[PDB]
Amino acid sequence: QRAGNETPENHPPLTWQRCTAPGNCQTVNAEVVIDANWRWLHDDNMQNCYDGNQWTNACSTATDCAEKCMIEGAGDYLGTYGASTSGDALTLKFVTKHEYGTNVGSRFYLMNGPDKYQMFNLMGNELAFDVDLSTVECGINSALYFVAMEEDGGMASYPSNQAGARYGTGYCDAQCARDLKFVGGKANIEGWKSSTSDPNAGVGPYGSCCAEIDVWESNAYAFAFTPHACTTNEYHVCETTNCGGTYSEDRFAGKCDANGCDYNPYRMGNPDFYGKGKTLDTSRKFTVVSRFEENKLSQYFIQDGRKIEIPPPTWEGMPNSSEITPELCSTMFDVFNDRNRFEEVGGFEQLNNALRVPMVLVMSIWDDHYANMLWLDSIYPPEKEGQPGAARGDCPTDSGVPAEVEAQFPDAQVVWSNIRFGPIGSTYDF
């Protein structure tokens, strides 16, 4: 896609840091960008190439779209998008009501100058941030995570994109992102499958794939660590029926494991841990750190000065520990018993490869027109209930429906902040 000339692009700045040792940290003045799927696309008459959830006749074919349209700057990030930045802290307003429209959920990427994403080396490293998610309700997923995006957002590998990271191009993830309007610096028109639910989205014949590490998927009633590798962990374009994931006919036909190996406490045995005023009281801010080693991914919290670890699972046949290890990942499948995709694409070993894949940092809020976030915070899938791991959370199986959460708590928002990273032992003194 060409880069627009109607609305400048002004990233909202952002501090974060690296810590070489437990009392040694120091700032990185950065800035964030919004994923390009939120942008206005238009030819040289300002006639859309997209509008509602569908393409216009400013376009036509795959290729020419990328030659005729340009995406634009987003104006003011509070205005249409509800994103608020002050110092280190990124804010994100679920639903935003503005003079010309209602936007819902966003995806922000962390950058490294306005042209290329900051890229993190995971293995032998931990990440730490602050999160205040006290107002995130059932049916809302406030996530933070890693995805092996390309630095320039794809502007070397796919030169049909004269926009790039600068305008948050190039997204991917182990769901193989078929909702994007461009993939591989190319259009997804020809087959754009509009949603019956959300008026502003679709699905083309092209998805964007890559490794996906869901450090933090969540609300104030349940969370989930979820690593995910692929048999190619680096960004890559899959072909319709050779795209797996959520937006597809076959969740499991593809190169990536859309489900990964998850550590959700509630799903694993302790329903009084996380939530409004629990062990991990969600009703203030707390610290999360997450560690990426060989065959060991580990998560712990700090809430009000105190170290909190995640309790081990109570499921007979799972290890006695709250870690992500070859041990975990195996045995939770004789437990939850169903499709071991994780293994299918080469087990943990493969996930260790993904860890040796520089990824982009992402923050994001949204709702779930497919599953209504059941899979995070309640009973999923509906279809038995009363079965090991069907319970993911305390929330009701009513909840999660877009239109209803969307005007039930518009001001839903997440407080991201104090993002630190470095060797293990180096971000927090614990």
Automatic annotation (TrEMBL):
Disulfide bonds join 19-25, 49-69, 59-65, 138-395, 172-210, 176-209, 230-256, 238-243, 261-329. The keyword Heme does not apply. Its EC number is 3.2.1.-. InterPro entries: ConA-like_dom_sf (IPR013320), Glyco_hydro_7 (IPR001722), Glyco_hydro_7_sf (IPR037019). GO terms for molecular function: cellulose 1,4-beta-cellobiosidase activity. The modification Pyrrolidone carboxylic acid is found at residue 1. The keyword Transport does not apply. It catalyses: Hydrolysis of (1->4)-beta-D-glucosidic linkages in cellulose and cellotetraose, releasing cellobiose from the non-reducing ends of the chains. Keywords: Carbohydrate metabolism, Cellulose degradation, Glycosidase, Hydrolase, Polysaccharide degradation, Pyrrolidone carboxylic acid, Signal. GO terms for biological process: cellulose catabolic process. PANTHER family: 1,4-BETA-D-GLUCAN CELLOBIOHYDROLASE B (PTHR33753), GLYCOSIDE HYDROLASE FAMILY 7 PROTEIN (PTHR33753:SF2). Belongs to the glycosyl hydrolase 7 (cellulase C) family. This is Glucanase. It comes from Melanocarpus albomyces.
